[PDB]
């Protein structure tokens, strides 16, 4: 009786999806918060 191995797609997605989402948040907030003119 063999069993399924843990999906390498899942294994690398666990590190990829949070990492890319965090980098996107970094870039988005950095490029949008500092946008208005100043005196």
């Amino acid at each position, epitope marked *: 009786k063999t069993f399924n191995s843990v999906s390498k797609i899942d294994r690398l997605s666990r590190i990829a999806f949070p990492l890319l989402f965090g980098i996107f948040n970094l870039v988005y907030w950095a490029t949008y918060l500092n946008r*208005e*003119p*100043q*005196l």
Partner: nanobody, 108 residues
Framework: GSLRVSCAAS????????MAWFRQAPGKEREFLAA???????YYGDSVRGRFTISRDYAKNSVDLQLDGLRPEDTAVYYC?????????????????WGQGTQVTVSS
């Protein structure tokens, strides 16, 4: 001497923006000549009040400046600008879009 410097915008409709003309002489800082608002209201600098006349063609998305009574100290690079007028209508920092500039010289 009389002149008319025109400015045409592309890639964005500036109907709801203020369009302005600035001037930069050699060594001197950039200064505000004129501005015109969506409400057809015209603002002028003290140095060029009554001489320079600003107008806008909203259909063509352009701003024109008629120059009359030119003098030797009017020699400078003249810049077209468009902006929302935040903290401004007179400060260059309030205008996000800028033209390349056009040289103008007066010879006696």
């Amino acid at each position: 001497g009389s002149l008319r410097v025109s400015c045409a915008a592309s890639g964005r409709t500036f109907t709801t923006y203020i369009m302005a003309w600035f001037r930069q002489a050699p060594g001197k800082e950039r200064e505000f000549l004129a501005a015109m608002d969506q409400g057809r209201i015209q603002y002028y600098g003290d140095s060029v009040r009554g001489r320079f006349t600003i107008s806008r063609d909203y259909a063509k998305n352009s701003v024109d400046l008629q120059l009359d009574g030119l003098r030797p100290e009017d020699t400078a690079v003249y810049y077209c600008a468009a902006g929302a007028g935040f903290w401004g209508l007179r400060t260059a920092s309030s205008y996000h879009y800028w033209g390349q500039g056009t040289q103008v010289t007066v010879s006696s």
